[model samples]
Target: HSSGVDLGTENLYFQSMVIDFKQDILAPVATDFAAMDHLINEGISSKVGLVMSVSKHVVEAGGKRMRPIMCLLAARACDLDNMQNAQRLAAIIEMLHTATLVHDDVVDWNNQTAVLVGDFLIARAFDLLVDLNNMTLLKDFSTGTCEIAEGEVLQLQSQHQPDTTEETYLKIIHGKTSRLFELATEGAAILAGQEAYREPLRLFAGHFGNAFQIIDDILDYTSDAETLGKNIGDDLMEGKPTLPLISALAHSTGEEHAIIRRSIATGGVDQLPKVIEIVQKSGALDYCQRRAQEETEAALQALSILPDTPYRQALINLTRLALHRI
Candidate 1:
């Protein structure tokens, strides 16, 4: 969580790069397909209109499209030269990522925030999937969606439970975050007709996804509104019990532990500052960062199966950038 302003600049650059790549690869049929326009209209569907409205707001607010770009880059790295397949897979990845965001916002009770507009966009994307009658893709999308929901429920159940361990946290994160990442990479492989790469791609994306989520939790304490596109310390306010805060409790006792426990028990904006202070004092932030770095290294190792190329390099660069924030 670098300063808000600097983080914004970095985010903008990262997102622009991803958008440019998508456009470059998809340009051949961009005019004929009207994918962007169709996507927008799909977002306004009356049956799930509010979801689309919210999702549209989120997409317009902007993001790095990191997951989708990973799909594209990984496919390209595997010698996937079909621009159409790459673009469709990228769209699929973005849709899956957006679906997770929708569900996550609901779980976190943050949907009222304007940043959540992307929720509706995700729903619209799913509707499009059904309409296309691509049963295989639809099944894959539904499976990922279900896993993500289950992951959130698991996390919710574990919240404030003293017995929750690092392993439990990792499992929850993998289910909620990494599952979509795995789907993104694997979907690209399927689209590229390179099914053999699916397993390795899943491993690479899963590690990277876990690392990214952990770092994001760290940023909740370290980032400001300008960079994070939401209030600073949002996670603490929501009592989300992210890995950092969870690990911090292990090393604390007496008044420190009591304070954290009470904060988690009574979550709201009021407890955010104090909880954040406790996490910092307990070295939770540092601990979480070290773990994230380790995951990044593992993600790089997983990438070893793919051929070395600029797209592959971008994948590595993006992982580095995820942590470079703070």
Candidate 2:
């Protein structure tokens, strides 16, 4: 119904790579990824030819393609599948992801355009997924995506609440970030008949994703934005109790503790000097940083459960890189 949409990488040009490429998690599957990109180009080539214009525009901009990269890694971790099918699936994931993004961002069009394009992307991807013919992979993506949606709902729930604990924060990022990681990696294991590798790959993606968002949250205190531009202290400024703020709340007391609480409740950086002062002085930043490393190590630990291959090693490197990312 919606082949007229321009679902290109240019649509996401506003975003940047959340992870590094030089570490080369995708190197082992670089050829496979190339194939996926070929399919991606091919997928958008027709689509009433309307797809081509915007697709090229997006390609003109380029992107991290991290989720698709994860798909390839899972391809290696698993036991077996036609390289062609896995390649197609990788493209399918990216198209669906971009479709979601297009629907999410209302910059260029009305709700009807956004809604129709997203539906088209999914419908087309589902066509490719069916060719792979694995209900397990299908179900993994379906349920994991549901979890992804729920995770966002929780994050909305956590907004502006001073006492959003680490426990709850896990629930937040697990959905918002990690679930897609699980979808990418776990579906790889599932599609290839690597049952043994499936759960482990899922864990690897989830923990690594958790570490990824934790580092991001740390950056919020350590950076969010303004009408003028990107706001420093975004998490604190918005009253989001990201890990750093939560840790600061845990470690401080007396006026410092109250200041932190009031800052969270009121939502601003007027007290930023004292807040950073308390965050650094109370050892919250150190604690959050260590926690980030802890998760990275654990993420790597899960990968060890999979077969030892260059692809596996790349995943390990990715996790370690993510830990120090900030």
Candidate 3:
């Protein structure tokens, strides 16, 4: 470690706070979230200890359980007062999401012990989803899950390719990241019996999903492991051509541009400062910030079709909160 390496990078990040989770998002559904929290525990429980152990370890390591809370809030926005099935659905969303994390870790590490009880997560989610007994629900999950898997594969396909564009990056993010956001909110509408509101919820989730990943890409360029749970250059280290790098290419020229290209092609942190510098000074960060804001506004716009209530406002506040995290 060296003092010269420090960049005093605080202002480079988006540090504004727009939503008060305690006063806004969570408080609106505190009781349901508490109930949902218990279900998350029960959902992972098993007679065998290891079956529960690894899953608990990974789930506990996660950040705020946003997906399920989105599910809970969407149900209430649809005006369905019964949280019984809604709670179970929220648990299913979290379990399925947790399974994706487990699979991602094991795939990246090639560790079999870490794969313990992995199949159980998939089985448990479907077992409960089956109780809902709607063939349509089953179909929806099947399709959405496939898209998520494909998105991850697409992201891998674009790795180290410096020419990867905004169009391809959006498709990749939609698959790997935003699609589940769709499932979280849209599925809530399905479970709530408000089939008519399904598309509006889907639209809201989809745009929010896009905004979420774009903000995440911004963090990758500006944040360190302590703040983002992953260091700066993690994406570049993996050779993945995320939006910051792509936008950087579109905005930089000659030496600065060449630095970014070579860094992406040769996966390492040796030139992270130069890459981060180009990403910031070349107007790429501003472009990404505006892209994230556009998607956020679209997300809030989609919610306009839904009934106005504290829950819906919470959803609005929640979208802004994602941006505020940057």
Candidate 4:
């Protein structure tokens, strides 16, 4: 059994430690996380060869597993003693996330195979969910999962639409990115039986998801593919009118406006250099940075409702670490 599962209250000395994602945020839950990882591998096992292989490959390729981490952290922060159910929920969250990625990458592999495998993952997640035996949690996830699909389709609808507003973009992101984050944290609250912490955890995860995705969009314009694990101009190439692009549209005029409009309407990186320059010079990046900071602050504020434990502090550090990316 993992010691330190109950991450003690934050003392002044412990608070002084530099905020490292692994050390500060993850160390306390390391053993529990290891069990969660095993559950993912075990949960994905299948009789069908293709389902087994594809699910195995994609889950292995997954980065960081931040959503499940957030769920585990939220559970401990609420002072939940037994972590068995939380661990299972974390695995289910990761399976759902892996399924979405598989579906999203229809452009990356055989469309039919990707589609089927993703469905298999979704099915597997639901299988695991049935064992948890909570109607409220199931209802929350069912609705959240539907919202996720809606968000993805909404993004598809908005594709190449240069006029996509930040308001509309928020709806898109809340569905696609933030919804799962909500499930991770809020679902943990539900599992922990800490009903009062649900809203606080939900709000924190929601704002954190916004900040995380916005920073990712900002990086699309500013960072390299190697750093982000996706092509640098992929969003622009896919004609996603993310925040930076939206802000660039709002802050520009004349040929500059036309250029961004054309870039979004017509997907390609041919004009990526020019688009990057415009995103930077038009102060769109700064606007995005400011927005990201605001979301991060809001996430921290929401977390304050929980008691001042190291788990909550880890959540706070996690929020800051996200903004630090940009």
Candidate 5:
């Protein structure tokens, strides 16, 4: 026993420093997530061969199932009686998200097959939601789904437009990114029959979503491909104005200003090196980092409304882990 004492101390030291996602955040809900995964596959099983193929392709492409994990964690935190309903709701959340990604992959803006498959997935998601037979749940998803679509359209409208303001960018992210997160947790509260917890969970997920997207946008400029498996400057390459670009515009002038505008307008990496340089030195990244911190704090504060529980602690750890990415 004494021989292993040094190793024990080392392990404790490391554990205090890092939040292991699998062991810390996910261990409690591992069983629920597995059932949810099974439900996802079962939910997508369809009579239409092509629908099944495309749905599986996109569903498989969805990494981590973070949204469903959030849903499951939320249900447990609310102390849900019938976890079965939470599992079904988690499955629906993933299917709806996969549908969005499938629709997003519509090349040149619209591939008829992909669009139809996305439609099918959406229909199936709604069909499953109907089986739950909760009027409140149905109403929330119906409205929340439209908001997600609107967020995507808003991003499209702002594409290549350099004048896109921070306020506009906030709206765009709220729709495309935060709205789904809101649905994930708030829907859990509704299904758990804890109406009182609804707004708190919504606010928590909403701010967390904003912080998540902002951090992702920040990484697009600063992180290496090896670090996050994402190519830096991808956001600029796509012409979708993210936070760093928006903040850069406000802080820069002269040639730096002209280059950023051109990069966004043309949607290429021709000026990528120069754009990256400006973004780094122009204080834009600092602003973004601060905003991410603000949103994260707001997210954590919202969680304070709920009672203390291990599930809630996991949510806090997950939030902090996301911030550590940058």
Candidate 6:
């Protein structure tokens, strides 16, 4: 998870110290060291305190920070010079991503070890946003937060429901995950004064999000706990009804169909092994991958709209990275 800290000690008794800190002494510093230190210490300390006190560990053990990196790359692609905006946008996007993790853990009731950490993160994010004193940025962050919640709820409703369709799945993903990426990309574009690029950037992010999530679904069965940072078959155990399972249902018959449905309808860890074996037999994983590859191609096509640059190459590299683990 991304951490923020801002620290500056001022003497209540000494007006000169306050003035110096704000202007004469600290103002000339090349970096906001005090602010950075305070934000980091406070953020980590508050979350750790929550973990020890409340037993709510919201931090997922590991993540690549790829979303923020994408935002930075997008900003660079737009030929922005002042990197502070890109950095701020990256941090805000990370905060939004971390907020979703908190809500998701609470909804899924899995990743308890990490959810405790996320609980603290959610609180810290709100507090930090309020401190930033930028109403426009705050509103943007809040809007993104709402979209993420709506998406997650949509996903939960779709799970295990026979009526669920591919369109619905796409909608859920667009709302929950893709919107965050869209916000990051578009927000950066807006900051860089490249409003014209917003729509194309959004399209790239949407396609990339779809491909990324599909690959994530594949990893649930194919990756080990240590590597994936959660148990293998975690999605099956949670009754997520991911693309592979949905596609498997489309092709199944007789006992194969019955077994798949029953497992989905009544998910438990013990049933996961059998369910995975069935999915492997049903060719659902391959189908899911093919669809993911198609989305990846779409993402690359969207990138073509941007001028050729190393940052564009980074976008392509990220798409490959998303699928590489799978």
Task: Output the number of the lDDT-best candidate.
Answer: 5
lDDT of 4 by residue, 1-326 (tens): 21221212323444434568898789777788999978876787646678768877876774677888888999898777779898999988988888888887787348899899899889989999999999989999999999999999999899999979999999999999999999999999998889999998999999999998898888878755446677667888888779999999999999999999999999766787898899989999999999998888778778877887878877877777677776
Tens-digit per-residue lDDT, 246-314, candidate 5: 999998999899999988999876789999999999999999999998898888888878877778877
**Per-model C-alpha lDDT, please?**
0.67, 0.72, 0.82, 0.84, 0.85, 0.67
lDDT of 3: 0.82
Put down candidate 3 lDDT per residue, 260-293, tens digits, no spaces. 9999988777788888888988899899999998
Q: What lDDT does model 4 reach?
A: 0.84
Give me candidate 6's TM-score against the actual structure. Answer: 0.75
Candidate 6 lDDT over residue span 141-237, tens digit each: 6887788788888877877665567788888888877888887776667667786787878888988898888877777777543565677777777
Clashing pairs in 1: 51-120, 52-120, 54-117, 54-118, 55-117, 55-118, 55-119, 55-120, 55-121, 58-118
The deviation in Å at residue 286 for candidate 1 is: 1.0
Per-prediction TM-score to the true structure, in the order listed: 0.76, 0.80, 0.90, 0.91, 0.89, 0.75
Off by over 4 Å in 5: 1-17, 46-56, 59-62, 109-113, 225-230
Error of 6 at 192 (Å): 1.1
- What root-mean-square deviation over C-alphas does model 4 reach? 4.3
All models, RMSD in angstroms: 7.2, 9.4, 7.9, 4.3, 5.8, 13.1
- Write model 2 residue lDDT over 1-326, tens digit each, in one string: 10111113312541223444654566788888877877876676665555455445444443467788778877876745576777877787787677766655454336675566667777778788777788987787778778877987787677778878889988888887888878788887777777887788888888888888877776655433232133557667756667888899899889999999888888876887788778877988788888887777667667767766767756765665455455
Q: Which parts of model 6 are misplaced by more than 4 Å? A: 1-60, 107-140, 223-226, 268-271
lDDT of 6 at 120: 62
Model 2, residue pairs in steric clash: 9-58, 10-58, 219-223, 220-223, 224-234, 225-231
Clashing pairs in 5: none
Predict model 6's lDDT versus the native. 0.67
